[PDB]
Structure formats: structure tokens, C-alpha cells
Design a protein around this ligand. Structure first.
Ligand SMILES: Nc1ncnc2c1ncn2[C@@H]1O[C@H](COP(=O)(O)OP(=O)(O)O)[C@@H](O)[C@H]1O
Ligand SMILES: [Mg+2]
Lengths: 156, 370, 156
């Protein structure tokens, strides 16, 4: 599944960003964070087309409404990261973990929106599989690696 | 090929698969809608949140319960709740699993009929069934005899069952449950200067009630103790760091179950209702009903409610009787556990309402099959 | 007789359960009771097939009606014990003689249903011995260890 692998490699990037936040990870300082923000935004735009296609192959008054909501969130988060990374690149070039916090917060927001988009896409594809167009996408509820939900604790 | 079990309570949705021993989805049965001004582009496209989605964002939402008192009042929000349950929480396709649903007794027939219709026509379930929650509690308790006192967010009901036979004339329903206690606690928290008005603040007060409230074994000595000392006062930290202290609101709020006149109701307490239900049963089954007082539901989860329950029923019943209150530790999910026991039963598989029968006989099939 | 020995070994289990109820027996606490409930339910399912066969080899408007009634009771009780034991197992794993009471009550119910099924099976086999099919079962009213009923007390 293209959606799953794209979102999950972005999750790898977003893990490396939190690891820099904890102060011990594969990124030395702000410049690595700026580069990571740029690539996570690019992968978010790719995710944006994947969501666009799954939405376009869906009936109107269907799960496509939530999916388009999450896609619009994705678009704002990716755009904020690209301009903010350009801003902080310029600031570094002229003159900062505090600076890294804005990019990391935007990345957290984007990753949360991407998780929401992933589950929305899965529901849209499963619910309307043998509707025409979705078959061409060939997303048969198995390419999605959906675990069974784990049982609740009876006593808390 | 595996049945689903959705326990639609007034407060929480308990959903899972028949055969399992615990629900896999337990989320609030609320739908939230934004009530403020969306000022960022794309951040206001989602117009409705369901379940934990709404409790997470409840600071900018208006939370609504589709079910009051066990009757579904909003059929478009409940429909959203069910869509969430099937697709986002359980992640199944409803048209392959038969679905077991639960309902309180003495409930409008249109409720059950419209549940049948929504299942069979919006979710295309192959079969469905509507079971009474107290019978399911007795299933989960491993008995076939006993009187069940089930209290949830919306309704408290007493169903006496003997050897698998219910006595429907002795069933008692009382529209006083967890949400009424939450409202009463919001009301009496104002005596200390704490004002919780919003629906989100109602969720905060529900949390306060679940964490701090308990049932006094003897109400008057507890009031005297709270007046004399400050030993019963406990603190609670609000979501923004303010700390509130409540002394006798802790046992005054649950006392409304035994003194419904606290909230202006004329009915009898749950002990009196239980006794009155036992005394509408045949004299030969009363001894076995006294000894099996199954308590289920989340409103029976107060510390000390079983002790007070037994003390009051012992006062009411004859002195030679055998009063036992059965309060399992997991009784917050007894209805779901019994529903999964029943839906997995081998002898139950001819008792589903198949979609063929629905197509023959309309939604009215549910009153004669169930 | 398979029916008699199965029911009577289940009676041994159900005796050990009551002995735990009295607080002095071969079971230390709830876990032993859960295990005993599981095995008594398994033996009840075995008893269920034994009853099924004896019923299937019987005429319709015969003692098979009562036997099927008791077999359905057996099915309900055995299933309740298996889920209840699983629920009690999860509760113990997360966090109880009061807990043991539900399993012991279900076990009492199952054992009573099994005694009823035993006598119903005996009546069905004796009443219809040289009907075809029952001979293949080879249950000639002697494999059943039926005592003569004891006399009533003339004066009470
Ligand atoms: N520990 C607790 N103490 C007191 N009340 C509780 C506790 N836990 C849950 N509740 C109350 O129980 C209600 C939910 O119980 P539940 O049986 O799930 O209701 P329903 O059957 O309506 O879904 C809520 O109103 C909540 O206030
Ligand atoms: Mg309930």
C-alpha cells in the first residue's frame, strides 16, 4: 500500500524529529531539523495526492467529507513547514532549539493529520470497494495493515 | 461469521466481538460540533466529532448525547455514533457480521423498530437482535435466577428472573441514573462557589463524580461527621490547574439513588424499588431473588453502594431471609459480557432476525422475534 | 457406560468446587476454580454429544423432548462457564471468593442439568432398546448403574 508506506516513512522522519527534541538523535542541530521539515512536507504533498485520488473515487455524501477535511489540514501544515523552514534558514544565515520547536510542532500537527487521513482513506476504500473507480485503485482492505483493536481492561 | 455486540448505553458505547471477554471499543456516546469561529483555512472543515474525538476537543465543541434515558432522541447523531463504532473503532464491515444490540425495558417501541430499520437498511447487517440489558447482566453473572439492578448513565431498571423465566409485571424502570447524579453534583457544587455550566464542564463534573464520590453506609452520621471535621474533604485539580475541594458533596450526590427527592423526584430509592420488585414476584421465588441481587452498570460502581444496598434491603426484608448483593468487579461491562455470551451461544443462532424476515415483515418483526 | 462415567467424573470436579466453597479442599484460590470450570465445561460439551447421539437414535414424540431440553440447558451453562472463567481470568490478570461464587453457581447448574440428562438418557435407552439405532449404541439398561429406589418412611 502506497498510503501506508508513505505515512510510515514520514513517521520515521517525525520520530527523528522528536529524538532531536529529546536531545539525542540523528540530527545535530537546527539545520538538520530544517532539512527534515522540508522532506516531511514534500512527502506530505505526495500524501495529499494519494488522498485526493481516494477522495475523487468516492461518492459525495460519504466518508470523503472527513477525508477532504484532513487533506486540507495536511495542506496547511505542509505549507507552514515550507515557509517556516525558509524563514529559519534565512534567520540562521543572517545571525536555537526554541527555533526548532515551531518546526517540530508543525511536524507533529502534520503527522497527526496524516494518521487521520490514513484511517479515513482506509474506511473510504473498504466501505466502497466494489464501487467503480475504487477497484482501479486496488486497495482491498488487506493492503492496509489494520490490526484488530485490542480488548479493553475490564477492571481499571 | 462472528457476531458483533454493541451495547448502546446513554453514556458510553461498548462494542466488540461475540465470544471475546471484553469490549474492544469503549468511548463516550457523544457528538460534538464546533461552537466558535474558525479562523484558519482548512481547520474548520470537520463539522462534527464523535466519541473520544469530541472529548479531546471538547473545549471548542458543544457536546450532545443522542440518547437520553435510554431512548434515542437524535437519530442522525446516533447514526453517526454507529458509523463510528463500525468503521473507525471496530474497523469491520457491518454487512458480514450479525449485530446484537441492547435496550432497556419499558422503552418506546419506535426506538427498537428504528434501530432495526437503521441496521438493516443503512448498515446492511445480515441479521440483528435486540436484547434486554438486565437479562444480559444475568448471563454475564453466570446465573439463571436473580433480580438484576442495572444502572447506567440514563436509566435504572430491576428485572427479576427465576430459572430463566422473567416476570415482566415485576420489572421496574426508573429514569434516574448517572447523568442525573452528574447534574445534581453540578448543582450542589455551586454551594462552594464552583460554577460548571458548559457541556464540557459537565464532562469535568462527571469525572469529579467518578473519582471522588461514594455511597455513605449511614447518611445522617456521615453528614454529622462531615460537619464536625474536615476528614472527608478531598481535592481535585481542574484541567487548567485550579484545585477544588468537596466535603459532603462526595456522598450527597450518590444519595440521590436512595433519596430521589433530592432532585425533586417522587419515586422510591433503588433499595425500595428492588424490594418492591421482589414483592411483586411469586412468594416461592422471593427467597432466591433475595439471595441473588445482581448489580450491573457503571452507576453501581460507587464505593460502598453494595454495603448500603444490602443494609437497606435487609431492613426491608424479613429477618430470616438471605440477602446477598452480587457486585462483580467488572460489572461496568456485565451487559456487554452477557451479550457476547448470548451472541456466541450455539442455541441462539436460530434466534437472529435475518434480513429475509425483515424484508417479509418490516421493522415490526423485532417485537415478535425479540 | 460412557455417559455415567463422564457425568460422575464431572461430579468429582463439582465436589472439589464445593469443597473450595467450604474453604478446605484441593483448590487454593480462584485460579484453581477457573481451571476446574474450564475442564468441567469441556466435559459438559462431551456430555452434550453423548446426549445428542442418544437423542438422534430416538423416535420423535418420545423421551427425546425432555432430553433435548436438558441438553440445551447444558449448552447454555457450559458456554457461560467458559466466557465467565475467561472474564475472571482477565480480571485477575489486571487487578476473590465472591468471584468464585458465579463460577460455582454455574457449575452447580451444569451438574444439575447433567443429572437430569443422565436419567433422561437412561429412560430413552431403556424405553426404546430394540428400536433400531439404540442397539448400535449398546446401552442395555445394565451399563446404567441404576439402584432400586429406596422405600419411603411409613411414619414421618
Ligand atoms: N467509578 C465510577 N463511579 C461512579 N460512577 C461511575 C463510575 N464509572 C462510571 N460511572 C458512571 O456510569 C455511567 C456509565 O455507565 P454505563 O453502564 O457505561 O452506562 P450506559 O449503560 O448508559 O452506557 C456514567 O454516567 C458515569 O457517570
Ligand atoms: Mg448499560
Amino acid at each position: 500500500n502506497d498510503i501506508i508506506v508513505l505515512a510510515k516513512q514520514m513517521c520515521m522522519i517525525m520520530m527523528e524529529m522528536t529524538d532531536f527534541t529529546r536531545g539525542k538523535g540523528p540530527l545535530k542541530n537546527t539545520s538538520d531539523v530544517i532539512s527534515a521539515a522540508k522532506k516531511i512536507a514534500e512527502a506530505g504533498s505526495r500524501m495529499d495526492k494519494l488522498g485526493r485520488t481516494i477522495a475523487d473515487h468516492c461518492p459525495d455524501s460519504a466518508c470523503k467529507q472527513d477525508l477532504l477535511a484532513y487533506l486540507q489540514r495536511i495542506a496547511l501544515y505542509c505549507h507552514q513547514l515550507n515557509i517556516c523552514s525558509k524563514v529559519k534558514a534565512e534567520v540562521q544565515n543572517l545571525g536555537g532549539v526554541d527555533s526548532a520547536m515551531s518546526l517540530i510542532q508543525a511536524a507533529k500537527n502534520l503527522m497527526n493529520a496524516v494518521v487521520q487521513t490514513v484511517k479515513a482513506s482506509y474506511v473510504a476504500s473498504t466501505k466502497y470497494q466494489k464501487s467503480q473507480g475504487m477497484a482501479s485503485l486496488n486497495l482491498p482492505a488487506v493492503s492496509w495493515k489494520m490490526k484488530a483493536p485490542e480488548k479493553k481492561p475490564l477492571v481499571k | 461469521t462472528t457476531a458483533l455486540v454493541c451495547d448502546n448505553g446513554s453514556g458510553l458505547v461498548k462494542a466488540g466481538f461475540a465470544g471475546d471477554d471484553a469490549p474492544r471499543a469503549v468511548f463516550p456516546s457523544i457528538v460534538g460540533r464546533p461552537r466558535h469561529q474558525g479562523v484558519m483555512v482548512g481547520m474548520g472543515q470537520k463539522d462534527s466529532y464523535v466519541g473520544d474525538e469530541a472529548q479531546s476537543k471538547r473545549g471548542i465543541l458543544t457536546l450532545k448525547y443522542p440518547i437520553e434515558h435510554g431512548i434515542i432522541t437524535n437519530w442522525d447523531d446516533m447514526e453517526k455514533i454507529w458509523h463510528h463504532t463500525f468503521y473507525n473503532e471496530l474497523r469491520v464491515a457491518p454487512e458480514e457480521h450479525p449485530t446484537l444490540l441492547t435496550e432497556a425495558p419499558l422503552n418506546p417501541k419506535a426506538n427498537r423498530e428504528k434501530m432495526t430499520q437503521i441496521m438493516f437498511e443503512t448498515f446492511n447487517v445480515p441479521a440483528m437482535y435486540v436484547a434486554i440489558q438486565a437479562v444480559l447482566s444475568l448471563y454475564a453473572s453466570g446465573r439463571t435466577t436473580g433480580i438484576v439492578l442495572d444502572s447506567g448513565d440514563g436509566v435504572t431498571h430491576n428485572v427479576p428472573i427465576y430459572e430463566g423465566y422473567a416476570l415482566p409485571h415485576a420489572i421496574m424502570r426508573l429514569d434516574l441514573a448517572g447523568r442525573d447524579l452528574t447534574d445534581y453534583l453540578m448543582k450542589i457544587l455551586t454551594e462552594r462557589g464552583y460554577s460548571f455550566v458548559t457541556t464540557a464542564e459537565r464532562e469535568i463534573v462527571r469525572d469529579i463524580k467518578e473519582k471522588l464520590c461514594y455511597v455513605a453506609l449511614d447518611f445522617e452520621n456521615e453528614m454529622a461527621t462531615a460537619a464536625s471535621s474536615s476528614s472527608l474533604e478531598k481535592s481535585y485539580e481542574l484541567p487548567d490547574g485550579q484545585v477544588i475541594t468537596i466535603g459532603n458533596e462526595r456522598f450527597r450526590c450518590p444519595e440521590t439513588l436512595f433519596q430521589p427527592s433530592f432532585i425533586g423526584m417522587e419515586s422510591a430509592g433503588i433499595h425500595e424499588t428492588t424490594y418492591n420488585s421482589i414483592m411483586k414476584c411469586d412468594i416461592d421465588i422471593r427467597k432466591d431473588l433475595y439471595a441473588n441481587n445482581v448489580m450491573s452498570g457503571g452507576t453501581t460502581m460507587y464505593p460502598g453502594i453494595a454495603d448500603r444496598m444490602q443494609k437497606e434491603i435487609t431492613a426491608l426484608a424479613p429477618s430470616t431471609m438471605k440477602i446477598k448483593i452480587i457486585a462483580p468487579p467488572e460489572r461496568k461491562y456485565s451487559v456487554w459480557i452477557g451479550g457476547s455470551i448470548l451472541a456466541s451461544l450455539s442455541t441462539f443462532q436460530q434466534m437472529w432476525i435475518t434480513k429475509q424476515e425483515y424484508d417479509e415483515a418490516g421493522p415490526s418483526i423485532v417485537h415478535r422475534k425479540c
